[PDB]
Amino acid sequence: MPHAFKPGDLVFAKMKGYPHWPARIDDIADGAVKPPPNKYPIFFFGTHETAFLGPKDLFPYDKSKDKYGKPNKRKGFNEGLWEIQNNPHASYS
Ligand SMILES: OCc1cccc(NCc2cncc(Br)c2)c1
Structure with missing residues (x-):
């Protein structure tokens, strides 16, 4: 049974104008800006940006890797695929 998203969960995350992108749910550091209601800090593998x-x-x-896990030409995407498959919980900062 699924649960609400928690830090460490691995996803593909969709933003307008980009393919479904390999990503993870991040933690919120102490005193850092918190997300709006019912939003989560999404760390994008490959590009190493957060939204x-x-x-x-x-x-x-x-559940989604068969559909969204194909390589493509977008900058950082293939490295993102590698990170989520090979070391998704490592420090990339
Ligand atoms: O719209 C706010 C916002 C926040 C972070 C990054 C971007 N664009 C670039 C980008 C980088 N990695 C994955 C994707 Br998917 C997209 C936009």
Whole structure:
């Protein structure tokens, strides 16, 4: 049974103008800006950028990897695929 997203969960995250992108739910550091209601800090693998997104844009990784895991030409995407498959919980900062 699924649960609400928690830090460490692996997803594909969708933003307008980009393919569904390999990403993880991040933690919020002490005193850092918190997401709006029902949004989460999304760390994008490959590009190593963070956005606040809601669950409607978050696709759990295992269920969605067959559909969204194909390499493409977008900058950072293939490295993102490598990171989520090979070391998704490492420090990339
Ligand atoms: O719209 C706010 C916002 C926040 C972070 C990054 C971007 N664009 C670039 C980008 C980088 N990695 C994955 C994707 Br998917 C997109 C936009």
